[PDB]
Design a protein around this ligand. Structure first.
Ligand SMILES: CCCCCCCC(=O)OC[C@H](COP(=O)(O)O[C@@H]1[C@H](O)[C@H](O)[C@@H](OP(=O)(O)O)[C@H](OP(=O)(O)O)[C@H]1O)OC(=O)CCCCCCC
Ligand SMILES: CCCCCCCC(=O)OC[C@H](COP(=O)(O)O[C@@H]1[C@H](O)[C@H](O)[C@@H](OP(=O)(O)O)[C@H](OP(=O)(O)O)[C@H]1O)OC(=O)CCCCCCC
Lengths: 299, 301
């Protein structure tokens, strides 16, 4: 467990609070913000969920990655002219369903999401889903469009994560602390394994990497790592031109949304946690409801 | 949106607080508790779900936190006091590490006898999502060896004819031109703090739901489970589908892991249950379990 220097997160370690703005005459004026931690763009908008004037709550509507040359003000204005419905319902978990909208022009790169209904896990796109009505029609009045520019870099979600188990190796784990306007949350993630080399030797290799950490708004909150120094011949062959790693933090740690919602978020500490790797023989139990017989749960 | 009567959850709608007990001289005495919703019939070989709770403490000495160690379903005829005593004689190590998410890794040692039906979990290392088995994983040390000192064994009996659900076994909820039967459940937590969640039961092609005479109770599968029993009547097609039986169970910490942060170290109780009848979500709607969507297919495979 060795701490990185604060300079490694100073430049981009801050994510601004999502907030509506007013014009000179007090009317809400939609806005956008671009994070670049420029044609591939991730879009996520925020709006008021209202009756069809009464404001029930705020909700996020992720649109995903699209390739576009349109100016962000044209993406924003077209988005605010759409009629987006909001429903609170359930599948396995409680859901927020956004209705279909159209026609599109500047937003055609995000048509897969916008032109048909979209079902989201309510916990990832809203803190207080219980405020959305079940007996009244609801609609989204968008006030902010968050944009994060991507480089077609390594972008991770739980299903694309690689195997972390290894038998004779040192795991390079990363412990990150977030200060929320103060409340402090922390999480750990596995970066890789240094296959067998002492823990101190591994630390010197990590110092030479000159890692930089920053935050983005992919999924509402993402962690971006950039290698500004040097890496091994084996890791260099695996990665090639890739120097950037990005993690969708609301998909890995959905519990973060309840904490960062409607608040500013910033990296306050980052530490390398070098531990023996978890052996391949150990069993992964993602679900606590385990069935050792064959009779209660299939495969 | 119609509320069920409180009588529908009175009998089994309560889950006791997990807490250690002391003897007449102040020393901790491990205990067990059996929950039998949806499995009240007595049989020699019982299907039993086991989850224990212990103090995570230093080895070479402070109590750092409490953690749950799920053992899963095993078929056994042993008395619960023999399962408990053998479990407390094992030397279980605890490690805080990471995969995709932060993990708590257990390691058991000591041969098994009454615990042989749970050997798959106990005889090799077990990697759990820290959020589902511990509220404050950041209290577990990274620079010291840690051990589990078990104080409670929670047991929930199962009936192999019943339906037991986890996210990967739950069925398709989308349908065109149907009415969804959704269920809104409220839990009162002593903390009182009230949490609520909704789940999809099925789709119809209120009076039919009243005739079902549903009963709701809580169990300790995964630390907290919801059990529904049909005491009235249903259609011939729905009885054939449910496997010719009237029990349905949901592992609530696997569906709604956020509940653990709220119910941890507290008693939990059903305070309200309502049917929420809505138009079904059409099949044309897209499911986005991950908020990081890639419409280009060039960023994510
Ligand atoms: C796109 C996927 C991610 C790309 C790499 C993103 C970075 C990353 O994950 O590094 C892993 C690497 C090796 O560790 P590790 O034991 O995890 O080795 C890899 C791992 O086993 C994968 O699961 C394998 O893929 P697959 O499932 O069998 O296919 C992969 O092989 P292949 O696939 O080649 O056959 C293995 O190489 O870690 C270091 O060198 C430690 C320093 C890390 C410093 C990082 C600082 C930022
Ligand atoms: C292991 C068993 C698990 C399932 C049983 C556990 C309970 C459960 O899941 O019920 C679902 C049932 C109907 O569900 P729903 O109509 O959405 O689902 C369809 C139904 O299952 C048909 O039988 C399937 O085949 P088919 O059309 O014949 O070909 C059809 O498949 P396919 O057309 O897509 O291929 C399914 O889409 O719900 C009610 O009746 C509402 C009252 C619920 C009352 C409360 C119950 C406690």
């Amino acid at each position: 467990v060795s701490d990185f220097s604060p300079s490694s997160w100073e430049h981009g370690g801050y994510l601004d609070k999502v907030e509506p703005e007013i014009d000179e005459n007090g009317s809400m004026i939609p806005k956008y913000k671009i994070y670049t931690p420029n044609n591939y763009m991730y879009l996520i908008c925020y709006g008021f969920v209202e009756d069809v004037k009464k404001i029930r709550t705020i909700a996020a509507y992720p649109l995903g990655v699209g390739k576009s040359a349109s100016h962000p003000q044209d993406l924003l204005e077209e988005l605010c002219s759409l009629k987006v419905t909001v429903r609170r319902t359930a599948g396995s978990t409680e859901k927020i369903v956004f209705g279909s909208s159209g026609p599109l022009n500047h937003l055609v790169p995000w048509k897969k999401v916008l032109t048909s209904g979209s079902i989201f896990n309510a916990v990832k796109v809203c803190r207080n889903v219980d405020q959305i009505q079940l007996d009244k029609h609801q609609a989204l009045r968008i006030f902010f469009l968050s944009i994060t520019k991507l480089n077609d870099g390594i972008y991770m979600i739980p299903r694309t994560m690689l195997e972390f188990r290894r038998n004779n190796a040192i795991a390079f784990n990363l412990l990150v602390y977030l200060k929320i306007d103060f409340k402090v949350a922390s999480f750990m993630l596995h970066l890789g394994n240094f296959v067998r080399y002492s823990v101190d030797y591994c630390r010197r290799k990590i110092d030479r990497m000159k890692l930089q950490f920053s935050l983005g708004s992919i999924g509402g909150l993402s962690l971006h790592i950039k290698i500004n120094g040097v890496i091994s011949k084996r890791l260099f062959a695996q990665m090639g031109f890739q120097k950037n790693l990005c993690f969708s933090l609301m998909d890995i740690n959905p519990w973060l949304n309840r904490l960062t919602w409607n608040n500013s978020c910033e990296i306050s500490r980052v530490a390398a946690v070098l531990q023996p790797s978890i052996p391949r023989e150990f069993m992964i139990y993602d679900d606590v409801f385990i069935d050792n017989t064959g009779r209660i749960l299939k495969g």
